[PDB]
Amino acid sequence: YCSQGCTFQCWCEAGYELRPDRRSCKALGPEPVLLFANRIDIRQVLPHRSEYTLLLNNLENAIALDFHHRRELVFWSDVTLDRILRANLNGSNVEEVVSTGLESPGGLAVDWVHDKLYWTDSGTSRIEVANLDGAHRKVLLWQSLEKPRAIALHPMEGTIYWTDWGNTPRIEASSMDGSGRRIIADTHLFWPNGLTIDYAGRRMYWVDAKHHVIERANLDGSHRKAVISQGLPHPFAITVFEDSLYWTDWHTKSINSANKFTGKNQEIIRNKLHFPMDIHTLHPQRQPAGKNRCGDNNGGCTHLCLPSGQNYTCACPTGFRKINSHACAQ
Template structure:
């Protein structure tokens, strides 16, 4: 298992996509040129590819996990691409866009069969995640204030929650629960993924929490054996033979990595390190995804791990106040 974490970093000095080992070592820059405002990230753990959307360039792009063979997958019809999610089982990439024509779209991981699957009653689609067990796509709308799911083609929509969720930014799913970050309440929450019951606040923070991911073998199912093109991601439904997930579980517990971009907070042994991002008035997110992480272990019944955020991650986070939040 590679045990790597990937994140986007947007500063006044420029934008980057980086990665490092889960223990904080070997941090490296994967992309720094031809980036404007990279936002959501998604890892293809089978084919070994990294997908991201750039709301400044209005593109969805892909490269190998080491940054090689960068390719633009989508370069038209996007206004404010926000989140991306990959389904390696069927070879599809999904995205949300909160621009003039808000929608949720999908495209083959080879760049074919593009379609809009949700376009009605949707305004600011933010969080996006997949339920691999039930073949569903979940999303949250930060303007309409709801969480919904649908079949993978956008049909059979169902509302999970439509109260007390003022500004969801990101979401994920594990077993019977959905987890999300909320900018207005500055909290991390969960609820039953179908009924919306048992809504619980897990963490309250001082600043706006950004992305959230759960790392567990259940969240990284093996893909089908599609023909692959290792030298040109985005051409061919790529996959390698199924291999170990990026981070394997221990004792059946899900390790929950809550990645915070504007706030670098380490909830492990009580350490808290803020990284302030002054925000402009109105609007919704500009930059996203993981400048640092929060390991939440207490409610999983395990002691916190030893995890160090390198100082280099925390420096140069003087973000532009023009970013819409």
């Protein structure tokens, strides 16, 4: 109710600047663009506009997406093709990144800090990682997993987040390697389709398509309040930005917005969509800066390192064996 920080007086942060109101915290840089998948296309929309921008076209079944704001990339999954691809955000140079091994690649997230691509496959019942080029590929979690959908990264915090909508309905987090596998919420869930981190707010939001709620919880999952509890016939994907929440809804076939704290100002940013899928806010502050755990240094032991805790741990591909925390070998 003070946007980002108080102590009577309000405060902004990082690349934000208090609006002519001194509660509101506007983001610096370019205008936020809402980026999202459409089964057939990948599109761009401007939160309070009719606006309409076809970014990628001849696509079979495009579900999950994410990006690398710097490096100017865009990855996306395809559930019939069972592939994960990337492109020049330009919209050019499209290329196969995860070919064999996919069934229902639901979740897809990019770790812009450590240049890693993470995804989930609810057919495979497993979460996986890789280089941006699509190489150095390695499975990450396979234990207990049923139907993982949404996946969120905190490169700064070196943590990963997700939702499991199988018979044990879960919102879990672990560290970017697979350690510290914790339950964030396992109660009053059934269809947790969406999940997003609001760094600048130090909170996580998620979406339940059975329970008709957008929920907010501290990153440890404590202080869990539902924010919106109506107008949610069937929500699928969500994203925060500034004070607003954006989500796709399969019933209303649309991109809806609303207020993070209140759940007031419910809006249909766009109606008449083919099939709204994954959505993100496309903006710099959505990919906030963070220290590379492998920086001016051993950029990945032999192959790829995984920000765990603080001390990044070393990591070997599928088929490979460790031999040390400097060394990888088949």
